[PDB]
Amino acid sequence: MNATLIDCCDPQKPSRVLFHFLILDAPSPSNLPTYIKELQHRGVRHLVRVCGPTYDATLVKSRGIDVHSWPFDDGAPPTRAVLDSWLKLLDTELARQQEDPSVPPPTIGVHCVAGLGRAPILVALALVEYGNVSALDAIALIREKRKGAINQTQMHWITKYKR
């Protein structure tokens, strides 16, 4: 498994990880049980799919992983609805940790198909919003681990973003 781990760190204490992001490939229906096991084995709390369904999410939900189906168009930046839902989820996970010192940093998975566009740009945005990393540095960081990630339109949108 074919996954890229990107840490989003506390701006104040860059020692401290806020979230672990996993950029993943989409599962095939036939390999779905193995795939779920591999998510569980990496402590995945939340799975976000930003592509059109290619499988039955209920099988994942039943194994303790929250699944979020927020499709947006290939080559596109997140819609405002997806973005707000993403920040809402991350805000909630952030409050969960602050409220309870017994909660370690959550791993949050994100897949589409290629992992070159839609998945990475959500992660990039999290780095900008919570890690306080500049847009250009978030892109470079993702590209280190995933060559060819993020098209020109996605690049422009993340360079322009504020809450």
Residues with catalytic function: 74, 112
Cα–Cα distance measured from residue 56 to residue 151, given in angstroms and rounded to the nearest whole number: 29
* Segment (H or E) for 95: helix 80-99
Q: Is 114 part of any known ligand binding site?
A: yes
- Tell me the CA distances in angstroms from 2 to 9, 25, 114, 123, one per residue in order: 23, 7, 11, 17
Q: Is 148 part of any known ligand binding site?
A: no
Q: Are 44 and 22 in contact (CB under 8 A)?
A: yes
Cα–Cα distance measured from residue 49 to residue 22, given in angstroms and rounded to the nearest whole number: 12
What's the number of domains the chain is made of?
A: 1
Classify strands 17-24 and 44-49 as parallel, antiparallel or unpaired: unpaired
> Among residues 114, 113, 118, 109, which one has the least CA distance to residue 73?
118
Q: Is 117 part of any known ligand binding site?
A: yes
CATH number for position 91 = 3.90.190.10
- Tell me the CA distances in angstroms from 133 to 19, 71, 163, one per residue in order: 14, 25, 14
In units of Å, what resolution does this entry have? 2.3
Q: Which domain holds residue 10?
A: 2-163
Experimental technique: X-ray
Q: Is 43 part of any known ligand binding site?
A: no
Q: Are 39 and 109 in contact (CB under 8 A)?
A: yes
* Segment (H or E) for 4: strand 3-9
Q: Is 52 part of any known ligand binding site?
A: no
Q: In the sheet where 66-69 sits, what is the strand order?
A: 3-9, 17-24, 107-111, 44-49, 66-69
110 half-sphere exposure, CB direction, 13 A CA radius: 29
Residue given tokens 């847009």 in the structure block? 135
